[PDB]
Amino acid sequence: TTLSCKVTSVEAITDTVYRVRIVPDAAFSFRAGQYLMVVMDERDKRPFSMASTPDEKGFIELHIGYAKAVMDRILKDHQIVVDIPHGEAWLRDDEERPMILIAGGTGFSYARSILLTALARNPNRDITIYWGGREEQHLYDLCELEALSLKHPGLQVVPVVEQPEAGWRGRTGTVLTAVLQDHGTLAEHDIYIAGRFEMAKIARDLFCSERNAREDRLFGDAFAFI
């Protein structure tokens, strides 16, 4: 569906990231983890994951920051045209397998939609979210994830920073290494990944070969394009 949407709010989370909230002119639906295309042209369509749950009733939340041109449409016109929904990496029905959500800088929107949707379905769900960035400040909604974790006993949040300051309390390095050291086997989990396509590609191979993960239970947009 091609829909024109009003921009109801724009906010600098950091200096590189915008929290953008849009309201389409007609009814809409998607599955947590799908993405939309910002229709810049008839030939220039730019993919962005819905960051909100598929029942944050009236609006769609986007985290933007190739983005500059999109921001310009958002800031000048306060309206954008979207083509939604797309993607085959949505939250599965499975009610029992423990979940692992992996977000590599730029994939937090995909992880957040799936997280909040899963917690609405079962607030006691066993969910571990990994978020990796180069520096502490790129994990821009980290305090909100920690507040959320206080309310959800099965929710564990694992912040991973590549080049941290001395004293950092989370993990250091990359997300794939944090995952391998926390888990003896990944065979029982449903795993959802967003970030650079290279990283999802290596994750897949590594998780299935060193941790016996099921490839059919490994979800991510990257796996539609490999």
Task: Tell me the torsion sign for CA atoms 60, 189, 87, 142.
Answer: positive
CATH number of domain containing 36: 2.40.30.10
Residue 56 to residue 61: CA distance in whole angstroms? 9
Q: Are residues 56 and 74 in the same domain?
A: yes
Q: How many CB atoms lie within 10 A of CB 91?
A: 22
Experimental technique, in short, is X-ray
Instruction: Tell which of 42, 62, 91 closes a domain.
Output: 91
CB 149 within 8 A of CB 142: no
Tokens of 188: 């029982």
Q: What is the torsion angle, in degrees rounded to the nearest 10, for the CA atoms of residue 206, residue 207, residue 211 and residue 216?
A: -130
Q: Which residues contact 105 (CB under 8 A, 6 or more apart)?
A: 132, 133, 134, 138, 195
Q: Are residues 216 and 108 in the same domain?
A: yes
Instruction: Tell which of 41, 63, 91 closes a domain.
Output: 91
Residue 59 to residue 88: CA distance in whole angstroms? 22
Number of domains within the chain: 2
Q: What are phi and psi of 73, to 5 degrees?
A: -60, -45
Q: Are residues 63 and 114 in the same domain?
A: no
Regarding beta strands 45-49 and 35-39, do their DSSP bridges make them parallel or antiparallel, or are they unpaired? Answer: antiparallel
- Where the chain is discontinuous (C–N > 2.5 Å), the residues before each break are 65
107 among annotated binding-site residues: yes
Q: Are residues 96 and 85 in the same domain?
A: no
48 among annotated binding-site residues: no
Tokens of 37: 């295309």
Q: Are residues 214 and 164 in the same domain?
A: yes
Residue 222 to residue 201: CA distance in whole angstroms? 7
CATH number of domain containing 127: 3.40.50.80
Q: Are residues 146 and 169 in the same domain?
A: yes
Q: Are residues 57 and 164 in the same domain?
A: no
Residue 147 to residue 220: CA distance in whole angstroms? 26
Regarding beta strands 190-194 and 218-220, do their DSSP bridges make them parallel or antiparallel, or are they unpaired? Answer: parallel
Q: What are phi and psi of 159, to 5 degrees?
A: -80, 120
132 among annotated binding-site residues: no
Largest CA-CA distance found in the chain, in angstroms, rounded: 51
Strands of the sheet with 99-104, listed across from one edge? 171-172, 155-161, 127-133, 99-104, 190-194, 218-220
Q: Containing domain of residue 206, as a range?
A: 92-226
Q: Are residues 20 and 128 in the same domain?
A: no
CB 24 within 8 A of CB 60: yes
Q: Are residues 23 and 126 in the same domain?
A: no
Q: Are residues 75 and 126 in the same domain?
A: no
Instruction: Tell which of 26, 60, 91 closes a domain.
Output: 91
Tokens of 70: 């999109």
105 among annotated binding-site residues: yes
Residue 83 to residue 226: CA distance in whole angstroms? 23
Residue 80 to residue 15: CA distance in whole angstroms? 22
- How deeply is 181 buried, as exposed, middle or buried, from its count of CB atoms within 10 A (0-12, 13-18, 19+)? exposed
106 among annotated binding-site residues: yes
Q: Are residues 120 and 36 in the same domain?
A: no
Q: Which residues contact 64 (CB under 8 A, 6 or more apart)?
A: 17, 18, 20, 48, 70, 71, 74
Instruction: Give the DSSP per-residue string, the chain.
Output: -EEEEEEEEEEESSSS-EEEEEEESS-----TT-EEEEESSSS-EEEEE--S-TTSTT-EEEEE---HHHHHHHHHHSEEEEEEEE-S-PPPS-SSS-EEEEEETT-HHHHHHHHHHHHHH-TT--EEEEEEESSGGG-TTHHHHHHHHHH-TTEEEEEEESSPPTT--SEES-HHHHHHHH-S--TT-EEEEES-HHHHHHHHHHHHHHS---GGGEEETHHHH-
Q: Are residues 129 and 217 in the same domain?
A: yes
